[PDB]
Design an enzyme around this catalytic site. Structure first.
Site, PDB file in Angstrom:
ATOM      1  N   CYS A 149      33.743   2.053 -10.185  1.00 22.31           N
ATOM      2  CA  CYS A 149      35.157   1.641 -10.218  1.00 22.31           C
ATOM      3  C   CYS A 149      36.036   2.838 -10.374  1.00 22.31           C
ATOM      4  O   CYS A 149      36.958   3.014  -9.604  1.00 22.31           O
ATOM      5  CB  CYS A 149      35.464   0.653 -11.334  1.00 22.31           C
ATOM      6  SG  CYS A 149      35.185   1.305 -13.014  1.00 22.31           S
ATOM      7  N   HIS A 202      37.411  -0.736 -17.152  1.00 20.77           N
ATOM      8  CA  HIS A 202      37.414  -0.918 -15.701  1.00 20.77           C
ATOM      9  C   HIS A 202      38.592  -0.109 -15.165  1.00 20.77           C
ATOM     10  O   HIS A 202      39.663  -0.020 -15.824  1.00 20.77           O
ATOM     11  CB  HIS A 202      37.551  -2.413 -15.382  1.00 20.77           C
ATOM     12  CG  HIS A 202      37.446  -2.765 -13.928  1.00 20.77           C
ATOM     13  ND1 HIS A 202      37.000  -1.885 -12.967  1.00 20.77           N
ATOM     14  CD2 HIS A 202      37.693  -3.929 -13.283  1.00 20.77           C
ATOM     15  CE1 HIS A 202      37.004  -2.481 -11.787  1.00 20.77           C
ATOM     16  NE2 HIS A 202      37.418  -3.724 -11.951  1.00 20.77           N
ATOM     17  N   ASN A 222      41.581  -5.025  -7.229  1.00 13.58           N
ATOM     18  CA  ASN A 222      40.226  -4.850  -7.751  1.00 13.58           C
ATOM     19  C   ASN A 222      39.377  -4.297  -6.618  1.00 13.58           C
ATOM     20  O   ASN A 222      39.847  -4.211  -5.476  1.00 13.58           O
ATOM     21  CB  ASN A 222      39.650  -6.179  -8.228  1.00 13.58           C
ATOM     22  CG  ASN A 222      38.536  -6.020  -9.259  1.00 13.58           C
ATOM     23  OD1 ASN A 222      38.047  -4.918  -9.532  1.00 13.58           O
ATOM     24  ND2 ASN A 222      38.133  -7.149  -9.848  1.00 13.58           N
TER      25      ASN A 222
HETATM   26  C1  LIG Z   1      33.326   0.336 -13.677  1.00 11.03           C
HETATM   27  C2  LIG Z   1      33.793  -0.965 -14.323  1.00 11.03           C
HETATM   28  S1  LIG Z   1      33.216  -2.328 -13.534  1.00 11.03           S
HETATM   29  O1  LIG Z   1      33.680  -2.344 -12.178  1.00 11.03           O
HETATM   30  O2  LIG Z   1      33.746  -3.506 -14.171  1.00 11.03           O
HETATM   31  C3  LIG Z   1      31.623  -2.430 -13.638  1.00 11.03           C
HETATM   32  C4  LIG Z   1      30.800  -2.177 -12.540  1.00 11.03           C
HETATM   33  C5  LIG Z   1      29.401  -2.288 -12.680  1.00 11.03           C
HETATM   34  C6  LIG Z   1      28.819  -2.649 -13.911  1.00 11.03           C
HETATM   35  C7  LIG Z   1      29.645  -2.912 -15.007  1.00 11.03           C
HETATM   36  C8  LIG Z   1      31.038  -2.801 -14.854  1.00 11.03           C
HETATM   37  C9  LIG Z   1      32.601   1.362 -14.562  1.00 11.03           C
HETATM   38  C10 LIG Z   1      31.429   0.710 -15.287  1.00 11.03           C
HETATM   39  C11 LIG Z   1      30.673   1.678 -16.185  1.00 11.03           C
HETATM   40  C12 LIG Z   1      29.359   1.027 -16.530  1.00 11.03           C
HETATM   41  C13 LIG Z   1      28.237   1.273 -15.727  1.00 11.03           C
HETATM   42  C14 LIG Z   1      27.033   0.654 -16.038  1.00 11.03           C
HETATM   43  C15 LIG Z   1      26.952  -0.185 -17.150  1.00 11.03           C
HETATM   44  C16 LIG Z   1      28.075  -0.428 -17.950  1.00 11.03           C
HETATM   45  C17 LIG Z   1      29.289   0.180 -17.637  1.00 11.03           C
HETATM   46  N1  LIG Z   1      33.510   1.810 -15.609  1.00 11.03           N
HETATM   47  C18 LIG Z   1      33.967   3.054 -15.646  1.00 11.03           C
HETATM   48  O3  LIG Z   1      33.664   3.888 -14.822  1.00 11.03           O
HETATM   49  C19 LIG Z   1      34.880   3.432 -16.778  1.00 11.03           C
HETATM   50  C20 LIG Z   1      36.275   3.804 -16.254  1.00 11.03           C
HETATM   51  C21 LIG Z   1      37.290   3.771 -17.377  1.00 11.03           C
HETATM   52  C22 LIG Z   1      37.493   4.899 -18.172  1.00 11.03           C
HETATM   53  C23 LIG Z   1      38.430   4.881 -19.204  1.00 11.03           C
HETATM   54  C24 LIG Z   1      39.172   3.724 -19.441  1.00 11.03           C
HETATM   55  C25 LIG Z   1      38.968   2.588 -18.653  1.00 11.03           C
HETATM   56  C26 LIG Z   1      38.031   2.609 -17.616  1.00 11.03           C
HETATM   57  N2  LIG Z   1      34.357   4.620 -17.456  1.00 11.03           N
HETATM   58  C27 LIG Z   1      33.234   4.589 -18.180  1.00 11.03           C
HETATM   59  O4  LIG Z   1      32.603   3.535 -18.296  1.00 11.03           O
HETATM   60  N3  LIG Z   1      32.808   5.721 -18.768  1.00 11.03           N
HETATM   61  C28 LIG Z   1      31.572   5.727 -19.560  1.00 11.03           C
HETATM   62  C29 LIG Z   1      30.755   6.952 -19.158  1.00 11.03           C
HETATM   63  N4  LIG Z   1      31.579   8.124 -19.440  1.00 11.03           N
HETATM   64  C30 LIG Z   1      30.953   9.439 -19.522  1.00 11.03           C
HETATM   65  C31 LIG Z   1      33.011   7.996 -19.656  1.00 11.03           C
HETATM   66  C32 LIG Z   1      33.541   6.986 -18.652  1.00 11.03           C
END
Ligand SMILES: *[C@H](CS(=O)(=O)c1ccccc1)[C@H](CCc1ccccc1)NC(=O)[C@H](Cc1ccccc1)NC(=O)N1CCN(C)CC1
EC number: 3.4.22.-
Length: 254
Positions: free
Chosen positions: A31, A201, A221
């Protein structure tokens, strides 16, 4: 002079076909990368007066940015846009469109809803390797296909500031907190009432309106055109609903 009570980026720049585009991030947590490349593709089109009609590669950024987090496991918004400035991003469409330098490698799927595409399930793919070479049949060199911006920035946590930023320069990326009840959204102006936190997200804000007295952000989205209100959703504007006004990030081509 000022901020209209309603605005929609698709309505101001309808020549810019990327604005109306809904993508699918597939069985991958990319995302963060999509809302980036989406807003950038919109903003390259907008800011160059139409001359920059391109679709930037989610996978280029997802796999090649080394300071952007964890790939399919989650990413950082600010550095994503910084990567766009210093290093740039090549072109790349989706898997079933097969276009551009580095198109997306994962197929479309259903995220918490029944549709045409096969259901996403809960598996997550390994973050693709960083390629640095375009697909066989796109002949423009990888290093030459890099589109860069001139600047990246956080937008202030400020309803009116976010609004002027969209109107003048295009859609912005923004993060918000996902709580369990979001996974049940079908339509309407979303607000978190119930559920635990699941994570964050990143999405692309394209405009805002008001539905009988009730103010909202119009958001794109990236779970394909089947989820929500034909891909888009709407969320309470004005009250930092799920921190939606806190994580606003964007930049400019010039
Ligand atoms: C995307 C969110 S999603 O589309 O809803 C999604 C997609 C697939 C699975 C679950 C959720 C990603 C999801 C991260 C994730 C991967 C695997 C398992 C659980 C969660 N989210 C992000 O990329 C977010 C972006 C973000 C940053 C700050 C504020 C709001 C949103 N970032 C994130 O999860 N991280 C954690 C890793 N990291 C080093 C910092 C950024």
């Amino acid at each position: 002079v000022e901020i209209p009570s309603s605005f929609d980026s698709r309505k101001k720049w309808p020549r810019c076909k990327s604005i109306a585009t809904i993508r699918d991030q597939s069985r991958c947590g990319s995302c963060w990368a999509f809302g980036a490349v989406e807003a950038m593709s919109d903003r390259s089109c907008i800011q160059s007066g139409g001359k920059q009609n391109v679709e930037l590669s989610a996978v280029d950024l997802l796999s090649c940015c080394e300071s952007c987090g964890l790939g399919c496991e989650g990413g950082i918004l600010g550095p994503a846009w910084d990567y766009w400035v210093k290093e740039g991003i090549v072109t790349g469409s989706s898997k079933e469109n097969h276009a551009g330098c580095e198109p997306y490698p994962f197929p479309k799927c259903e995220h918490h809803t029944k549709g045409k595409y096969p259901p996403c399930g809960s598996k997550i793919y390994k973050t693709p390797r960083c390629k640095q070479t375009c697909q066989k049949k796109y002949k423009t060199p990888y290093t030459q296909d890099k589109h860069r911006g001139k600047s990246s920035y956080n937008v202030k946590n400020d309803e009116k500031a976010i609004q002027k930023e969209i109107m003048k320069y295009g859609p912005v990326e923004a993060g918000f907190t996902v709580y369990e009840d979001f996974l049940n959204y079908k339509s309407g102006i979303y607000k978190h009432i119930t559920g635990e936190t699941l994570g964050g997200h990143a999405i692309r804000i394209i405009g805002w309106g008001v539905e009988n007295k009730a103010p909202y952000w119009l958001i794109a989205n990236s779970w394909n055109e089947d989820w929500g209100e034909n891909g888009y959703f709407r969320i309470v504007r004005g009250r930092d609903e799920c921190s939606i006004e806190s994580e606003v990030t964007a930049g400019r081509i010039n």
